[PDB]
Amino acid sequence: QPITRENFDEWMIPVYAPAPFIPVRGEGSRLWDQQGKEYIDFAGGIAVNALGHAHPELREALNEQASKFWHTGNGYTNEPVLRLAKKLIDATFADRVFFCNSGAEANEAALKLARKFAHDRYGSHKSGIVAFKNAFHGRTLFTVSAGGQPAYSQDFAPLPADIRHAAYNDINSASALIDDSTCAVIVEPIQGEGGVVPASNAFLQGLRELCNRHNALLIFDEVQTGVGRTGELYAYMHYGVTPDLLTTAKALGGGFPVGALLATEECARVMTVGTHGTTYGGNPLASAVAGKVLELINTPEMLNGVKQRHDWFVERLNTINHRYGLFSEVRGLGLLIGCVLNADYAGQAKQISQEAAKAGVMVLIAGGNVVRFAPALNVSEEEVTTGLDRFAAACEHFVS
Amino acid sequence: QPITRENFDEWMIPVYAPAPFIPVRGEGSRLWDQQGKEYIDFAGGIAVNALGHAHPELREALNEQASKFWHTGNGYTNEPVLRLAKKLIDATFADRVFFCNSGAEANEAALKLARKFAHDRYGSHKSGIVAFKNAFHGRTLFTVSAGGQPAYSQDFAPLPADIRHAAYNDINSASALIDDSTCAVIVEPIQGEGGVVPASNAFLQGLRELCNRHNALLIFDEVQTGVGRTGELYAYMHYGVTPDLLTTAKALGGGFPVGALLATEECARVMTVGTHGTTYGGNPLASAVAGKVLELINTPEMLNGVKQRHDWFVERLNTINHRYGLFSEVRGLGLLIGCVLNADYAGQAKQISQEAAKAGVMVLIAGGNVVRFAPALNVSEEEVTTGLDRFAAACEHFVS
């Protein structure tokens, strides 16, 4: 009758090795497990819970809609999805929006759009997708092939063709591969799963120029960096560089699964009826929640609060690092932050993460070499201080 | 300030041409638009709203969970997702489950699993996927290439390689393509988007034998046919044939986006840590709702009620067809039903569907030649009678 962690190994296809403990409830940046142990949540659902757990406003938005209707599919549109498209359109470089269920699906849409756009304006010979080493764009066949970790793509071959990977942050690597045959350049403004590595300002200017020069669409995968995470609504705003396509998901639904492709008028025009689609994308429920999310997150008091919190994190992480000497650098932007291990401790991010869990704070990794922080954007000063106290206890246990 | 249908053409990437009217609320099999016109909903969200609109029980399940927590991502499991895995395991041939956000993602998982399984037990040369003409498996690059409507895949080339299509319901077509190099045979037990065409009993026995003989995994895409739609929990039960992998989505979450891959112990074992994944899949919210759905749908009174309703539909559709002579045949199973147009009216399913909307009933199409019905499983006798009255009015207007 009771549910146990041993139940997980018996019943789930074993793609994840999750925590020994099982969460049963949360509020804000706190989470509790079956035994009532209390965690401070700096993982934030992997950058998804931008307003923390069980937020009262997301809850009324969800239940208000849920009492009218949840879903019709896309033969019918709805008021929530349309208010949401509008909020996005007004807030970003975008003119049109397409909604779906996840980051992976949004990137699939973006790449398909790019392929179609080049076939239609230039010719069927123009198919190349240029992405970057260590990129993560999701787990579908297409998006994992565009993603730059061959370990996640090897087994599933033959992979869609005409994808090449340049070195992140290397403008020369990219120009080597970008030419008149390229339809798309897909890039994360900050590499998330790949070590929390920010783009340099030059690198994104350079890509934009290469795109212009060669008529490829520039796609920014802001699935991990979007919706306030950097201190601005999107990273493209921080950098000053405008993409042709922008994918967003994750924080956008603050816990409810949703993704979006933002596009210029020129690009959208090309996706005609029946050329793509989704069954659940743009449903009333998801749209009512993301709508509320945008409204709460897209305010100067929140966004400025993100930069404030960045400083809380960085200051205290350095104090900590000065004492214990784990990290060679602390990097990232707003509230996507990475502590990179120095060579003494290389490859042990996971162990530190497990130590943190024992001390009662949830952090992530980003490769074996980086401890990743992605707390809720409305994380309180007190939760930050407590959670960093626990993280420090953890670093102590770990150093031995 | 008010939201209008003209707003849809201004703001959405135009992949859908939805209805002139916009739904604002529903209850059961009734839906209302902005002007308060009343529709009977035989489209049921494209076979998704198995318990109709804004169902009171789905609502408390949703709000109960939503007050504990919505999401952590998969470094952490949860009680809802585990109760759900268990319900499924107990109810089906499956031993293990993997959860995701949609049918498309579930099929991506299934095919990737199959590719990996063959690479691991036989060798990297064994990669072939055999699917069928007119199959629909979703809109990712991989699943649309496995899908059998070249119009939806052409523009996005180069497509993943080693996919071939046999003729549905043709055992000889399939044996021509299935050999020792095949890793997977993916099939819909009833082709949904492709004309509501049921599989013959022979055809699925035959595929199962071919699979066994050649060591390919048999995958049944029950995304459209699963969760009661046929009168049994899944179509594989109606047919007597057990697949190796089963994908399900759609009705499973009764409106909330969710998909699942059901697998035998032998197959699951092969998907090791980090080989696949999803950010939202298996989240508490989705799992609490599908859990309730399964509990309401997987009962002899519902399932038997589905067969009862099948008869209501078929009887009255024939009365109607005898009067107006639109349809050459009425086909399908349980509450997935197709009225196939005779040659006089070929290609005009969409027009009939538009006539139906004017008369105040929502039906679907399945190609230009078939009017498709997928009402909620708990559709009441009265809603069925009223909606078929309106459908009949519609058929009258249409015949001229």
Numbering used by the authors:
A (entry chain A), B (entry chain A): 3 to 402
Please share excerpts from the published article on this structure:
Escherichia coli possesses two acyl ornithine aminotransferases, one catabolic (AstC) and the other anabolic (ArgD), that participate in L-arginine metabolism. The arginine-succinyl transferase pathway of E. coli provides nitrogen for growth via a series of succinylated intermediates. In conclusion, the E. coli AstC protein, involved in arginine catabolism, is a PLP containing transaminase that is structurally similar to the related protein ArgD, which is the transaminase enzyme used in arginine synthesis. From the biochemical data, it appears that AstC and ArgD are biochemically similar, consistent with the ability of astC to complement an argD deletion. Both have comparable steady state kinetic values, with a strong preference for the acylated ornithine derivatives AO (AstC and ArgD) and SO (for AstC, at least) over ORN itself.
The native, non-tagged AstC that was purified from E. coli was the apo-protein, with no bound PLP, as suggested by the lack of color of the purified protein, and confirmed by a UV-Vis absorbance spectrum, which showed no absorbance in the region of 320 to 500 nm (data not shown) which is characteristic of PLP containing proteins. We were able to obtain crystals of the apo-protein, although they diffracted to only medium resolution (2.75 Å). Consistent with our spectrophotometric data, there was no electron density for the PLP co-factor in the crystal structures of protein obtained directly from purification. The A and B protomers in the asymmetric unit differ substantially, with the A chain having electron density for almost the entire length of the molecule (Gln3 to Ser402) and the B chain starting at residue Ala21 and ending at Ser402. The B chain also has no electron density corresponding to two loops in the A chain from His142 to Ala163 and Val274 to Gly283, respectively. The two protomers do not form a dimer, rather dimers are formed through crystallographic symmetry for both, the A with another A protomer and the B with another B protomer. The loops missing from the B protomer form part of the dimer interface; analysis of the PISA output shows that the A–A interface buries about 4763 Å2 whereas the B–B interface buries only 1906 Å2. The St-ArgD structures are most similar to the B protomer of the apo-enzyme structure of AstC reported here, in that the N-terminal ∼23 amino acids of the structures are missing as are six residues in a loop from 277–282. The reconstituted enzyme was more heat stable than the apo-protein; holo-AstC and apo-AstC had apparent Tm values of 46°C and 43.5°C, respectively.
